[PDB]
From a paper:
We then transfected the DDC‐KO cells with two AADC catalytic variants, R347Q and L353P, which resulted in loss‐of‐function and an altered profile of dopamine metabolites. By combining several structural approaches (X‐ray crystallography, molecular dynamics, small angle X‐ray scattering, dynamic light scattering, and spectroscopy), we determined that both variants alter the flexibility of the structural element to which they belong, whose integrity is essential for catalysis. This change causes a mispositioning of essential residues at the active site, leading, in turn, to an unproductive external aldimine, identifying the molecular basis for the loss‐of‐function.
Aromatic amino acid decarboxylase (AADC) deficiency is a severe inherited recessive neurotransmitter disorder caused by an impairment in dopamine synthesis due to the lack/modification of AADC, the enzyme converting l‐dopa to dopamine.
Numbering used by the authors:
A (entry chain A), B (entry chain A): 1 to 322, 342 to 480
């Protein structure tokens, strides 16, 4: 294809994308296909001659869309939001056009320089401690990572390298592997699976800190674990504290665990992948208090700040531990896209106030769902509602709640996922779509309430 | 922004992208900016009120473009090609629209199922051994990785887990760390830096195998290293054999090293990030002979098969070592985009024959540059020209060749990068742009020849 044909087909794709978004409420949010549906519908080999664009777009509607889970339908209330905004789509078109691979500054200066400035923009929007910002010859700085999972791995590997070098300086009689079998990392029992995967990749032990009644990491539980593991010969070196847990959107107490990690020389990484976007709002900034004690901080613009995946924002206090010219030792890959264009377009076309209004609308809708649940004494709220997540369940057995979830997700009118809080099976209601409104939340609750009546009926009859 | 405004701005962006591509030969390929140019030109904080799309696109032209290295200019002859095709751009627009995060099959079935079929399409285009393909209940299969660097790390981690489990089964008295200090991985002395980074992340030793006069790994050098390291107590467990080295596009001898790795129970990973795309052409498929001995194989569609970054294709013979429903234990992150749409659009809109013509044109242009160099006895060809890379230098000192490279890259009419072959400073000429023609290569050589006269003059005067 040459540029003249792209002028035609590109504008046709723009109209197709806009049509899909405008009619997305007519789509069944979760598909009815079963695993392996697609292979019989597609030829077994690539075509030798080109297919037409009309043939391909027809296939998108006829065989791809039936197997799509529509994350951006207003009736998608599963996991956490993923970002979809037209400013980011426009920047992504330019990103593929410039098409640079910014593994070095010389590979494309603007790709690296815009990223450094955008991470300062975002750090200032979150009122991060100045030690995390790159402006004005600070030793800290920020980088875009592909994902919060990758950011947690990068922080673990940096912590691993630092503790090995420290221990080998103290006792030069020590091999790297001899230190390896002693290292232990920590996280909450509510931590995302990315922490376990990072520990497995890094080759170190990982232990969960028991959370309190609010499912938060506290100083008392951390001190109890440290007392045990240090007496056993383990060397704590890395901690993932979570702000906005994937299970119930709980918050580890950084004001308590931060000072302890500093005193113990434990690298403190803060995982705020979802909740971090809300900290641009002054009424939620208190949830980030204690980040001044952290060695690294991370959240995902590509969940809930409208910067299409991939875009994970990671700050560190000392870049040496990982002017910014190179981004090589900051990430796991060497190559990277011009992803800072997406942040630049989104921040500029929405403004800080536009992003704040987006966050506040979602949190308002979350409290609207909470209000409806709190009006039905057959249900209970399991964790305090703070952001765009509500954890709820039918009072009674785990089975009756499992039955409710299966009934909901099988109806495929809305989509939810559950979690386990201790031994308790719990349903999650997450505000996700950019275009969700009060009417959608009210309809979803009516659906949930009707299926609960069926399921409660079936447990006595 | 709502969809109606995206209908306008999206088509405006289509025209901007098409205008940039059509006039790209009027751009200076490498920028004149210096590190840190951008911060003074951009405000220090994000705007509170939205900026206009007109203001942003004006800034793209005025402050972003001056700091862009134009990888898709026909005069970009540096590193290796990176992919830019309009079919991939169209699919990427749809990918951001569907906006699924396919960490599981249920997260969006089509995102996982199309990927499995496209990796079979591509595996069949390369005439890969059937053990690598997923179709027909085979134990092997393919996955898209973010980069060849990530693919090499994934293979190393899989090899690490397998050898630990094997050694602990043989001697249950062994800790993981006790095995760690003995493990050693191997690669050519021409290997990409991704191998060293993978060994550092994985916590294992890495040793380079000396290459022969053609800069290829051979059985004799590998057997000599194994004899030494096994006697020293090291346990070989992982090997990266390279087809199309980053330095000089040389090829490790898989027919020799493959059987050795199998006999030694060394996981054989084949890194063919650049050269792999040419193996869809029957006249180059012989360069892949011996891949039947490999445990994993990887190449980048996002270098030289027109699938815009990111798209790295990795096959394994046993998926257990990492029907396909989940792609979690295949990669380093958990989340992923609908990147298989790009392969589907490119393969269908070009056809196998269109992609073959693309490869063959680039290789023809490479031989055209080689022909010009071979007509000037002041120069020498350092390595056999096989694909889209030519390694050449002025006969004489390393200094005179360093001076030639500085003179070229400072003129900023074309862009080249060098390499070191043993103690020899060598210039690289890589065919990169989708739209490069014979006239561009002929102009570049005339430029190189003129600057060589200046530099040779300056070494005697």
């Amino acid at each position: 294809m040459n540029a003249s044909e792209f002028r035609r087909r590109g504008k046709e794709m723009v109209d197709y994308v806009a049509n899909y978004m405008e009619g997305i409420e007519g789509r069944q949010v979760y598909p009815d296909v079963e695993p392996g549906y697609l292979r019989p519908l597609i030829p077994a080999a690539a075509p030798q001659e080109p297919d037409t664009f009309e043939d391909i777009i027809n296939d998108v509607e006829k065989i791809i869309m039936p197997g799509v889970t529509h994350w951006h339908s207003p009736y998608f209330f599963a996991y956490f939001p993923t970002a979809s905004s037209y400013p980011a789509m426009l920047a992504d078109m330019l990103c593929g056009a410039i098409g640079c691979i910014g593994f070095s500054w010389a590979a494309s200066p603007a790709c690296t320089e815009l990223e450094t400035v955008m991470m300062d923009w975002l750090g200032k929007m979150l009122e991060l401690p100045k030690a995390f910002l790159n402006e004005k010859a600070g030793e800290g700085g920020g980088v875009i990572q592909g994902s919060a999972s990758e950011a947690t791995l990068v922080a673990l590997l940096a912590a691993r390298t630092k503790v090995i070098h420290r221990l080998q300086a103290a006792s030069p009689e020590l091999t790297q592997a001899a230190i390896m079998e002693k290292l232990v990392a920590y996280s909450s029992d509510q931590a995302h699976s990315s922490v376990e995967r990072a520990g497995l990749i890094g080759g170190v032990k990982l232990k969960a800190i028991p959370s309190d009644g609010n499912f938060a990491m506290r100083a008392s539980a951390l001190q109890e674990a440290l007392e045990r593991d240090k007496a056993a010969g383990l060397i704590p070196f890395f901690m993932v504290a979570t702000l906005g847990t994937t299970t119930c959107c709980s918050f580890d107490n950084l004001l308590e665990v931060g000072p302890i990690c500093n005193k113990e020389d434990i690298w403190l990484h803060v995982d705020a992948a979802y909740a971090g976007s809300a900290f641009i709002c002054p009424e939620f900034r208190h949830l980030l208090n204690g980040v001044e004690f952290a060695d690294s901080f991370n959240f995902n613009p590509h969940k809930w700040l409208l910067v299409n995946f991939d875009c994970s924002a990671m700050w560190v206090k000392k870049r040496t531990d990982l002017l910014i010219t190179d981004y090589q030792h900051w990430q796991i890959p060497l190559g990277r896209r011009f992803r800072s264009l997406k942040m630049w377009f989104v921040f500029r076309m929405y403004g800080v106030k536009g992003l704040q209004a987006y966050i506040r609308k979602h949190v308002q809708l979350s409290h609207e769902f909470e209000s409806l649940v709190r009006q039905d004494p057959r249900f209970e709220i399991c964790v305090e509602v703070i952001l765009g997540l509500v954890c709820f369940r039918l009072k009674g057995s785990n089975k009756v709640n499992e039955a409710l979830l299966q009934r909901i997700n099988s109806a495929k009118k809305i989509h939810l996922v559950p979690c386990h809080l201790r031994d308790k099976f719990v349903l999650r209601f997450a505000i996700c779509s950019r275009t969700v409104e009060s009417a959608h939340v009210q309809r979803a609750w009516e659906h949930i309430k009707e299926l609960a009546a069926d399921v409660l009926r079936a447990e006595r009859e």
